[PDB]
Design a protein around this ligand. Structure first.
Ligand SMILES: Cc1cccc(Cl)c1Nc1c(-c2ccc(CNC(=O)CCl)cc2)nc2ccccn12
Ligand SMILES: Cc1cccc(Cl)c1Nc1c(-c2ccc(CNC(=O)CCl)cc2)nc2ccccn12
Ligand SMILES: [Ca+2]
Ligand SMILES: [Ca+2]
Ligand SMILES: [Ca+2]
Ligand SMILES: [Ca+2]
Ligand SMILES: [Ca+2]
Ligand SMILES: [Ca+2]
Ligand SMILES: [Cl-]
Ligand SMILES: [Cl-]
Lengths: 5, 236, 236, 5
């Protein structure tokens, strides 16, 4: 999964 | 509200303790209580709110994905019938997840967003609105899926418009908004080219402004820039 | 009971799904529902019950320790007064922990232990009784602390007596009982020499019986033997 | 902390 903040 | 009798300052203090103890459900309940006092949140308090709900919903999302994968395998050809239990339990977790998202969206709508006049706060809250609609979109399959996706898009877009007008290209909130909206494009909106273009443009415009920053600000901005680069590497 | 309308087999199936999803609170609730159906548990089902509650109470114990350490530091000389919040929140976590322990002890008393006639099941349940009294002892400070400690001791002792008569010295349940009772001696009963003697004797008697075992049984027994050795290394 | 099972 891609990075989120 | 359950926390109606506790002082605002005590709720904030206990949220910080809950964080230290990795008690994120408690942390979220304390921060919900703090929001419901009706006063605006500080910068630190916004972070606490975010951290609490991110951890709660993050655990739910991970569980949902595990269960969804099991359910998908059960519906493959030659898979033995095991009855309604997988679907039922996936549905249970899904409903709990949706409830958390609805709680967060409710706090934003009553009344965090409307009282937020400074760019940093308004962008922070609109980003969160986009994020929690995004989480709802991840599990949506019915006749409201398109509307949920559009609700996420609309919140992110309003946040983007404010951020570009009012914040420097290295601002952490602006960067994190772009990171997440880029992920929305890739994972939710079936727009990988838009995702890639946004991440690249964001990265490059931040790079060009780093020279203005102190050591401490530089650290913050470059951390998020590396997340943009990580996603770009994943996608290209 | 909340799970009264769900089939026993469905509760077991969902406990296994909850385990895969790392949803241990759900797992515990499913297994409580299964126990409350009134039938004896299988070997596999005993493991599920153990795993669920161990993970739930383990998280509570970790949180309690964090909060207790903060509270201890607040009561040091020259530490600034921060009000009742640390104590209150430690008390909240403590009460929740005690509630989980009371739930487990209640399942054992109604009616798992009394219906358990085979050595493996009876020892398993009495070990669990000792464990959950041990967790209550960890947080006890009042006029019942001695009685709680003695309740743990008594359960462990009955389990030990059965295990020595009825099970080989390599049996995993027997080994795990000895491991935990040894920890009780060291950490709860202020008897480190008894702790060390028990761990050593257990280890040595298991070593001498390994030659009787298949590869698979050998793996199980040697894993727990290494935990005994680890504790011995910590204590000597 | 010591090991338990
Ligand atoms: C980037 C972001 C966007 C939104 C939410 C989060 Cl949780 C993060 N995470 C984050 C932050 C951060 C910056 C400002 C606030 C709030 N302050 C005010 O409203 C004033 C909260 C968090 N800084 C960083 C730095 C590095 C990595 C992530 N960061
Ligand atoms: C040792 C122990 C004692 C008690 C509880 C647990 Cl969770 C463990 N953990 C464990 C086990 C294990 C063996 C039997 C059962 C139940 N079966 C019947 O009643 C029949 C459940 C668990 N095996 C191992 C092997 C290696 C390490 C730990 N193990
Ligand atoms: Ca007040
Ligand atoms: Ca649903
Ligand atoms: Ca292209
Ligand atoms: Ca039935
Ligand atoms: Ca108490
Ligand atoms: Ca000695
Ligand atoms: Cl369910
Ligand atoms: Cl509290």
């Amino acid at each position: 999964f891609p990075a989120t903040v | 509200g359950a926390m109606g009798s506790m002082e605002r300052a005590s709720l904030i203090q206990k949220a910080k303790l809950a964080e230290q103890a990795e008690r994120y459900e408690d942390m979220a309940a304390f921060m919900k209580g703090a929001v419901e006092k009706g006063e605006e949140l500080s910068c630190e308090e916004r972070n606490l709110l975010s951290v609490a709900y991110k951890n709660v919903v993050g655990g739910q999302r991970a569980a949902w994905r595990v269960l969804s994968s099991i359910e998908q395998k059960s519906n493959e050809e030659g898979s033995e019938e095991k009855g309604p239990e997988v679907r039922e339990y996936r549905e249970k977790v899904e409903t709990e997840l949706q409830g958390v998202c609805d709680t967060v969206l409710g706090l934003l709508d009553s009344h965090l967003i409307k009282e937020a006049g400074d760019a940093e706060s308004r962008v922070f809250y609109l980003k969160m609105k986009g994020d929690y609609y995004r989480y709802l979109a991840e599990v949506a399959t019915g006749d409201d899926k398109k509307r949920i996706i559009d609700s996420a898009r609309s919140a992110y877009q309003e946040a983007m418009d404010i951020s570009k007008k009012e914040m420097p290209p290295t601002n952490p909130i602006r960067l994190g908004l772009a990171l997440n909206f880029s992920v929305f494009h890739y994972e939710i909106a079936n727009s990988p080219e838009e995702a890639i273009s946004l991440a690249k443009t964001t990265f490059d415009e931040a790079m060009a402004d780093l020279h203005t920053l102190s050591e401490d600000s530089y650290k913050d901005s470059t951390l998020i820039m590396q997340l943009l680069r990580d996603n770009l590497t994943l996608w290209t």
